[PDB]
Design a binder for this molecule. Structure first.
Ligand SMILES: [Fe+3]
Ligand SMILES: [Fe+3]
Ligand SMILES: [Fe+3]
Lengths: 134, 134, 134, 134
């Protein structure tokens, strides 16, 4: 599970949003610091939380990686991103996780839901998971 | 973390040892049933627990995926295996995880340690993690 | 924490239903094996799952320990129980959880909900948590 | 459960050191925000981290709640504290944990260990868990 101190949207933001991420091995430390083991893959969308919230407002579509769900939302434009792949998945802790970098520019698909009570009142509907990029 | 009901060696055996695994999408259900989210990658060694315990008994070498550790052990022979890769990493639960199959035959490297009190007394030293395959 | 391989009803039964429990220090081992740390308190209702499902048919009331919920149900009568209190809550693991036995006879209040798809199809409504005892 | 971003000493201080805590129902929110479920009990020692580090210099004793450990230390004197007891342990989440306040003055016993690499280098030995109070 996610760290209990974070809402789904807050944990989404920590993992999936970074406007100018450093190289993956550095950028991933901010995520893995909250974990017991290294995340095997992660995509940083180079955008803002507010921008993703706006994408939550368009037409509801099927989630490509969760095909029983239809609370997903696709961006109208391709966005710059940085994908990170764990090179040493046998790592037993987070002291030494190494990542390969794959920059790109793709549409993204997010699942959105009603906010958590701990979420800011500014956005009643928020992204809760990055489903995929296209 | 691992499920607390299992020792490191017991959880290793559930993930890493299967003599005749079915296709990955089926085989992985046995692992993911104990998890909240799908495992992103997994290698089934087509061998027995006792055989891996014997490999724990050879010369201690550096762990390729944990280079500050030197409690790893490499098999003397290549062993048949099945590697499973998660095709839909955006899956939000374990109901629908889909895997790609990659059979192979490789040396394996395991980290071994003294057993847990809950582990069987038969093996005082046991494999606790699959570090990598070669 | 509930192990994901169990439904809420299955986990409820494991923690809260035992017709003839042994001493608490023995009885609690089965529950604590699913945990990283000793459970601080646990009440074993000396009853059957069928008895509790019957109570789910009683008048719904507000849950005393979850006041925003109204799917709770109080037993019409007191039932025999074994309450277990953790003697050494400073324990850092589950190697030696020690409990004081407090046998008794009290009313119980359970929350009841529609069955999980994994639950038996023959009980459409099942107990999912022990709210309190009186 | 201790969030991995904290050392044992840091997590000890968060749970067990508060010089002037507010009412328990307020004071416990900071601890329960790191948790999925309400903590059943918690003792706030009204002291300073420097005071507790001094106690680590006292005569080592067997840990009362961890009898296989001998790195515990008892305070020479009673110290002011606030003990908090969970009123509604049937609570299913941390939305409304309610606590009873039990102010007091007791001896405390802490386990002390060598610092984590992430801990300040200026205290070579630090408290890592509150074993019990007397
Ligand atoms: Fe993992
Ligand atoms: Fe606990
Ligand atoms: Fe708990």
């Amino acid at each position: 599970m996610r760290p209990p101190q974070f809402t789904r949207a807050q944990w989404f933001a920590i993992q999936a949003i970074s406007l100018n991420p450093p190289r993956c091995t550095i950028a991933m430390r901010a995520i893995n610091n909250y974990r017991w083991r290294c995340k095997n893959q992660n995509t940083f969308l180079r955008t803002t939380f507010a921008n993703v919230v706006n994408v939550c407002g368009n037409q509801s579509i099927r989630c490509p990686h969760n095909r029983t769900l239809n609370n997903c939302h696709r961006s109208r434009f391709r966005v710059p991103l940085l994908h990170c792949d764990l090179i040493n998945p046998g790592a037993q802790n987070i002291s030494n996780c190494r990542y390969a970098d794959r920059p790109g520019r793709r549409f993204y698909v997010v699942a959105c839901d009603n906010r958590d009570p701990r979420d800011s009142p500014r956005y009643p509907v928020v992204p809760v998971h990055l489903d995929t990029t296209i």
